[model samples]
Target: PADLSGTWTLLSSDNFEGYMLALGIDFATRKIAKLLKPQKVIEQNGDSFTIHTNSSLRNYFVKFKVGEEFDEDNRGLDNRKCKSLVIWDNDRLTCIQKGEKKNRGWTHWIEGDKLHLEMFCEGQVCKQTFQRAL
Candidate 1:
């Protein structure tokens, strides 16, 4: 139930390569991804949410309601199919992706003007921070 309905632009990323490696992303994709700055647009209406991850290299989109499990085709990123579910844990939005990988998920939280995200898979974790777009 957090009001995360706005556009955010990436400010910094840490250890994204490690996370991509854990996901088994190809060399070319990883090369381009490491250099790209992605923007996130979150549209939230009550418990329903739609997130668009836009980047120069590729874009990803997902929509779901809280507490409902849905099919996720990670087409542009890793191309892995999974059943994903999102839930609100306090002010943080947490997603659990049940797929071929272990501990695959991401969490989104806001801090003042910053939107922070942590992505994890296997033993790798990637942290990204974003600022509200003008």
Candidate 2:
């Protein structure tokens, strides 16, 4: 329900370390991940979406259609495999990652020229804001 295509650059990230800790990410990787500024390139065509998160340290890519379940191998980040599903909640795109960890998911929405993201793992929540790439 929202136009999410185009590139978005990271503006701010909050409580990212706490979120990563809940996801069982190692301290070594977390130290590096926390310092990097990532860019999100999203391509939305109808109900299909391709999201690429790029950074100097690591790059993550995902492709999925709304309401379809797919196997998601989070290689570089957590290296955890999960059954992932994405759906639209009003203008927000919400994702569910079912794996060993409980209540793991992420939500994304667009506000003005900024992109808002909330990533949750267990009890930790990471909020990230991004600006539309010009």
Candidate 3:
């Protein structure tokens, strides 16, 4: 199993607001999310993993295995229910959330010694970079 086990602190984000906009998130919520610096905690146990995204405005959590599909509540964030499955694209972690909009998903990977997370809604992809928390 891939070891994505660490606490990551937000370093930068790009096109995140646009990605939320594609999800039909309103102006006020978008503004809050825009300024909210998120922290991600990932834990791996065998082939399963749990990810926690924390911010001042809201918190999101999801747990799943590589091949098993799971129900993601996505409450507090977008309120969109999704059946999600994550897979490995080589060393990269990729997922597809089947709901709300077509081709909705997120990817997590390591690039240049930093952890990179890319979230997508419809066609817009939100890019967020984070470094391991000390």
TM-score of each: 0.96, 0.97, 0.93
All candidates: CA RMSD (Å): 1.0, 0.8, 1.3
* lDDT (Cα, tens digit) per residue for candidate 1, span 1-134: 46888999889999999999999999998988888787899999999999999986678989999999998999988889989999999999999999999999999998876899999999799999998998
Query: Which ten residues in a row are the worst by lDDT in model 2?
Result: 29-38
Q: Is candidate 1 or candidate 2 better by lDDT?
A: 2
Candidate No. with top TM-score: 2
Q: Is candidate 1 or candidate 3 better by lDDT?
A: 1
C-alpha lDDT of all candidate models, in order: 0.92, 0.93, 0.87
In candidate 2 the C-alpha lDDT for residue 131 amounts to 87
Which parts of model 2 have CA positions greater than 4 angstroms off? none
TM-score of 2: 0.97
lDDT of 3 by residue, 1-134 (tens): 25778999999899998898888889998887778887999988877898998987678888888899998878887888999989998888999999868889999888766998899988899998999998
* Preferred candidate (TM-score higher): 2 or 3: 2
